[PDB]
Scaffold this active site. Sequence first.
Site, PDB file in Angstrom:
ATOM      1  CB  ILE A  12      25.630  84.541 -51.662  1.00 40.63           C
ATOM      2  CG1 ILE A  12      25.318  84.748 -50.175  1.00 40.63           C
ATOM      3  CG2 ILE A  12      25.811  83.070 -52.021  1.00 40.63           C
ATOM      4  CD1 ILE A  12      24.343  83.735 -49.577  1.00 40.63           C
ATOM      5  CB  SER A  14      30.141  91.111 -47.082  1.00 37.64           C
ATOM      6  OG  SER A  14      31.388  90.543 -47.446  1.00 37.64           O
ATOM      7  CB  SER A  16      27.202  92.972 -39.631  1.00 39.75           C
ATOM      8  OG  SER A  16      27.412  92.379 -38.363  1.00 39.75           O
ATOM      9  CG  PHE A  17      31.467  92.605 -37.778  1.00 38.47           C
ATOM     10  CD1 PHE A  17      32.425  93.595 -37.933  1.00 38.47           C
ATOM     11  CD2 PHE A  17      30.289  92.919 -37.121  1.00 38.47           C
ATOM     12  CE1 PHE A  17      32.209  94.873 -37.449  1.00 38.47           C
ATOM     13  CE2 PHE A  17      30.068  94.195 -36.635  1.00 38.47           C
ATOM     14  CZ  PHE A  17      31.029  95.172 -36.800  1.00 38.47           C
ATOM     15  N   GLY A  18      31.690  89.415 -41.564  1.00 38.68           N
ATOM     16  CA  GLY A  18      31.805  88.067 -42.084  1.00 38.68           C
ATOM     17  C   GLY A  18      31.431  87.995 -43.545  1.00 38.68           C
ATOM     18  CG  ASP A  19      33.376  87.297 -46.754  1.00 38.24           C
ATOM     19  OD1 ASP A  19      32.925  88.442 -46.547  1.00 38.24           O
ATOM     20  OD2 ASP A  19      34.470  87.092 -47.319  1.00 38.24           O
ATOM     21  CB  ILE A  20      26.855  85.340 -46.580  1.00 37.73           C
ATOM     22  CG1 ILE A  20      26.803  86.422 -45.495  1.00 37.73           C
ATOM     23  CG2 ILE A  20      25.700  84.363 -46.402  1.00 37.73           C
ATOM     24  CD1 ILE A  20      26.869  85.885 -44.077  1.00 37.73           C
ATOM     25  CG  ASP A 125      22.906  96.666 -39.209  1.00 36.08           C
ATOM     26  OD1 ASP A 125      22.824  97.804 -39.717  1.00 36.08           O
ATOM     27  OD2 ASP A 125      23.563  95.737 -39.728  1.00 36.08           O
TER      28      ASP A 125
HETATM   29  C1  LIG Z   1      24.379  89.050 -47.174  1.00 35.49           C
HETATM   30  C2  LIG Z   1      23.461  89.631 -46.130  1.00 35.49           C
HETATM   31  C3  LIG Z   1      23.533  91.137 -46.132  1.00 35.49           C
HETATM   32  C4  LIG Z   1      23.859  89.119 -44.738  1.00 35.49           C
HETATM   33  N1  LIG Z   1      23.450  87.748 -44.569  1.00 35.49           N
HETATM   34  N2  LIG Z   1      23.981  86.984 -43.603  1.00 35.49           N
HETATM   35  C5  LIG Z   1      23.362  85.815 -43.782  1.00 35.49           C
HETATM   36  C6  LIG Z   1      23.698  84.706 -42.931  1.00 35.49           C
HETATM   37  C7  LIG Z   1      23.802  83.432 -43.469  1.00 35.49           C
HETATM   38  C8  LIG Z   1      24.151  82.391 -42.619  1.00 35.49           C
HETATM   39  C9  LIG Z   1      24.391  82.674 -41.280  1.00 35.49           C
HETATM   40  F1  LIG Z   1      24.736  81.691 -40.433  1.00 35.49           F
HETATM   41  C10 LIG Z   1      24.270  83.978 -40.829  1.00 35.49           C
HETATM   42  N3  LIG Z   1      23.923  85.009 -41.632  1.00 35.49           N
HETATM   43  C11 LIG Z   1      22.453  85.843 -44.860  1.00 35.49           C
HETATM   44  C12 LIG Z   1      21.606  84.828 -45.399  1.00 35.49           C
HETATM   45  C13 LIG Z   1      21.503  84.613 -46.772  1.00 35.49           C
HETATM   46  C14 LIG Z   1      20.666  83.598 -47.225  1.00 35.49           C
HETATM   47  N4  LIG Z   1      19.925  82.773 -46.447  1.00 35.49           N
HETATM   48  C15 LIG Z   1      20.067  83.029 -45.136  1.00 35.49           C
HETATM   49  N5  LIG Z   1      19.455  82.375 -44.107  1.00 35.49           N
HETATM   50  N6  LIG Z   1      19.786  82.849 -42.893  1.00 35.49           N
HETATM   51  C16 LIG Z   1      20.640  83.841 -43.168  1.00 35.49           C
HETATM   52  C17 LIG Z   1      20.857  84.004 -44.552  1.00 35.49           C
HETATM   53  C18 LIG Z   1      22.534  87.120 -45.361  1.00 35.49           C
HETATM   54  C19 LIG Z   1      21.859  87.817 -46.481  1.00 35.49           C
HETATM   55  O1  LIG Z   1      22.111  89.230 -46.439  1.00 35.49           O
END
Ligand SMILES: CC1(C)Cn2nc(-c3ccc(F)cn3)c(-c3ccnc4[nH]ncc34)c2CO1
EC number: 2.7.11.1
Length: 290
Positions: A12, A14, A16-20, A125
């Site tokens: 869904i 990216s 900071s330093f990873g893929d979501i 950030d």
């Molecule tokens: C992609 C970004 C720019 C960055 N990002 N990272 C996350 C994330 C997801 C799991 C996790 F373990 C750590 N981070 C999410 C995120 C998305 C949806 N529902 C979420 N719930 N909590 C976080 C989260 C998003 C959204 O926006």
Amino acid sequence: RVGNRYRLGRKIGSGSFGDIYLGTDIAAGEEVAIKLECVKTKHPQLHIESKIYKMMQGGVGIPTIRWCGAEGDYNVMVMELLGPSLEDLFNFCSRKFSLKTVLLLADQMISRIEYIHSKNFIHRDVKPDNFLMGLGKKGNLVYIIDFGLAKKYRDARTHQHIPYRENKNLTGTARYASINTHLGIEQSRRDDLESLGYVLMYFNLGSLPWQGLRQKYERISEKKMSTPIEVLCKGYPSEFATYLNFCRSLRFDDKPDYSYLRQLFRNLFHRQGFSYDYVFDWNMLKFGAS
Ligand SMILES: CC1(C)Cn2nc(-c3ccc(F)cn3)c(-c3ccnc4[nH]ncc34)c2CO1
């Protein structure tokens, strides 16, 4: 599949330093968000972020961790699924937030930043994409995410503030970065709140004056330093200029007066005669046929 009770899915975005990724809880049937980092990166940082996330647990607007571990060639963290980011909603609202919506968000965003500071960390950030709305009953609760660039600013044992120092590794989004960041100065609490101020004016104006110019970082810095707050906030209530001036002039190690900053907008919220129904711009969009 991931862990014990979570299946994997789409990519869904990216962080900071990873893929979501989208994830599905098998046991409870609820949907979750999953972050994956390849193990063999020479600079692993997912575990660091997870521990910060764990430290933030229990606070208002902090996503709840469902699981965090290792699977295959990835470190993995599982979060409760949240709603769209403020940037997503900003685009859905045609990149124009009403003054009432901006003040509503401002009150929560200040408290989210305060809470992190209360846990001895600075976000570094602060940007619209890192504020996500809750779902269901929490649909009016602003969450703060993405602690990848976070950093301790005082010792846990003694609260000793980090020394004033040069930090030229520009870390964070340029558009909302504090001027201190551009000048290669170690970020402190004032920098998170200064960045938030630029976010609020971003919502008000629809675009910051230093938009659309390594080379670009210098150009943004020059325009940011060439933009007086009076020019930036012209046409909008004085509290926004007051908010930015307070954060910019805050001493490096000073604890911000979070209550004073929130009351600045709360008083303006009352003076403007705004209802406290907690109804946002995106709750007023109309729909129909093409
Ligand atoms: C992609 C970004 C720019 C960055 N990002 N990272 C996350 C994330 C997801 C799991 C996790 F373990 C750590 N981070 C999410 C995120 C998305 C949806 N529902 C979420 N719930 N909590 C976080 C989260 C998003 C959204 O926006």
